[PDB]
């Protein structure tokens, strides 16, 4: 059982490296889904205001 | 004469049972050690997969 529970430990040890890529993925995803679309929506206003 | 034999039998049976118990459980211990190496690489695929995503 010491060796069996160690399987869970190495899984967590790797899951940490998975979530490290998840942050980076979520960051780029927010640039494409939030930051850039909002910047486009703001330009419409500056044009239709004229 | 029976007693003299009975005690050695029991004495040897301690060791035989002890060694048998070890041999019997020796398989699953290695199965755990081997899986320990395997799982590391099974989830390592997740890291590489996410990196390309």
Curated annotation (Swiss-Prot), chain B:
Spans through the membrane: none
Subcellular locations according to the entry: Cell membrane; Endosome; Membrane, Caveola; Melanosome
Domain of life: Eukaryota
Assembly behavior: Heterooligomeric complex of flotillin-1 and flotillin-2 and caveolin-1 and caveolin-2. Interacts with ECPAS.
Record-stated family: Belongs to the band 7/mec-2 family. Flotillin subfamily.
Described function: May act as a scaffolding protein within caveolar membranes, functionally participating in formation of caveolae or caveolae-like vesicles.
Protein name: Flotillin-1
Boundaries of the shown chain within the full protein: 212 to 264 of 427
